[PDB]
């Protein structure tokens, strides 16, 4: 709802992730809308909207997702849009698309910081106060919300000029629908 | 290891709210005086005093994490009560803000010093006092954040 506030919890260690990655069997229980996921090289974010768990292809590639019934093959894929999705895991909670069409958006980081962002285009939007690029790293696939708490898009890439981030490039909610055919 | 931005505090006579912003635990002069805060290494003297502003600050205690100042300029606030209820509020002037749902005066009492938060969860002011017409609180006064910054220097 409003106001937006977030908090972060860690569930798995380093040795744990590696072993799980291979075996492809994950038995931990699930909660929340955004999940912190990780591979071997990278570690980023994935967001549940409307029964589907979505993330960035520059992170997930073509991989399956470790569930308690073994590995689970992707439902949708769209390389050209940098998007991917699986069925949302048991115990997750889904978001609902925006309708207000409001232009004041809010980015959620992997540290559970809520950053104010002002819309420009359909894929772009500007930071209200600049941050170093290192800070925004690892938060790809995190949701951007309207003030009512609804999904507007997903953080894809950042605009920087000398190691300082100025704006953000994101995947809009319409491009989910698109990809589901 | 679970930490809070907002402290429920007490003296002998009254009982109110404190809110940690930018390394400082903040509150109102009309609840505090020039009192020290209690720590297990004994008493701790105030860092910033401002009679004109109804403002007081100590160094932030143990088991506290700070809020960040609002950046969005939004005028659609949300006040937090000492029972942790959320009241929607609409900003008029620099320190004025009108309730969206007017309330009995009993219900806002003891919740001074508490925060007024923008939609992003960021911080905008601290609740100074309630405006009442025949016992029914209709708007609120608050200390803006730009003050707690100019006070800091």
């Amino acid at each position: 709802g409003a106001p937006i506030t977030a908090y972060a919890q860690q569930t798995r260690g380093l040795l744990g992730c590696i072993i799980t990655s291979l075996t492809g069997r994950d038995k931990n229980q699930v909660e929340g809308e955004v999940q912190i996921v990780s591979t071997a090289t990278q570690t980023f974010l994935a967001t549940c909207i409307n029964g589907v768990c979505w993330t960035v292809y520059h992170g997930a590639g073509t991989r399956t997702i470790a569930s308690p019934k073994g590995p689970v093959i992707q439902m949708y894929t769209n390389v050209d849009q940098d998007l991917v999705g699986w069925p949302a895991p048991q115990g997750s909670r889904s978001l609902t698309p925006c309708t207000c069409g409001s232009s004041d958006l809010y980015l959620v980081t992997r540290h559970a910081d809520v950053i104010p962002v002002r819309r420009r285009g359909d894929s772009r939007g500007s930071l209200l106060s600049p941050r170093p690029i290192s800070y925004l790293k690892g938060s790809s696939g995190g949701p951007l919300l309207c003030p009512a708490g609804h999904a507007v898009g997903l953080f894809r890439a950042a605009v920087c000029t000398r190691g300082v981030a100025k704006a953000v490039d994101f995947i809009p909610v319409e491009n989910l629908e698109t990809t589901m055919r | 290891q679970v930490e809070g931005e907002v402290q429920i505090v007490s003296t002998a006579t009254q009982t109110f709210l404190a809110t940690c912003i930018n390394g400082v635990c903040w509150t109102v002069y009309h609840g505090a005086g020039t009192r020290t805060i209690a720590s297990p290494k004994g008493p701790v003297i105030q860092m910033y005093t401002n009679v004109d502003q109804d403002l007081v600050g100590w160094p932030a205690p143990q088991g506290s994490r700070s809020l960040t100042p609002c950046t969005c300029g939004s005028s659609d606030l949300y006040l937090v009560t000492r029972h942790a209820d959320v009241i929607p509020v609409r900003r008029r002037g620099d320190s004025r803000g009108s309730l969206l749902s007017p309330r009995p005066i009993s219900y806002l009492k003891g919740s001074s010093g508490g925060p007024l938060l923008c939609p992003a969860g960021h911080a905008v002011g601290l609740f100074r006092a309630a405006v009442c017409t025949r016992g029914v609180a209709k708007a609120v006064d608050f200390i803006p954040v730009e003050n707690l910054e100019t006070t800091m220097r």
């Binding site: 860690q10 990655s21 591979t39 991989r63 992997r110 | 937090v80 029972h83």
Partner: peptide
């Protein structure tokens, strides 16, 4: 090529409340 693994969560649906002792 391995599998994607969940290692944490971020919860939006949390609302302010008084930390119990």
């Amino acid at each position: 090529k391995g599998s994607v693994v969940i290692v944490g969560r971020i919860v939006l649906s949390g609302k302010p409340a008084i930390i119990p002792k």
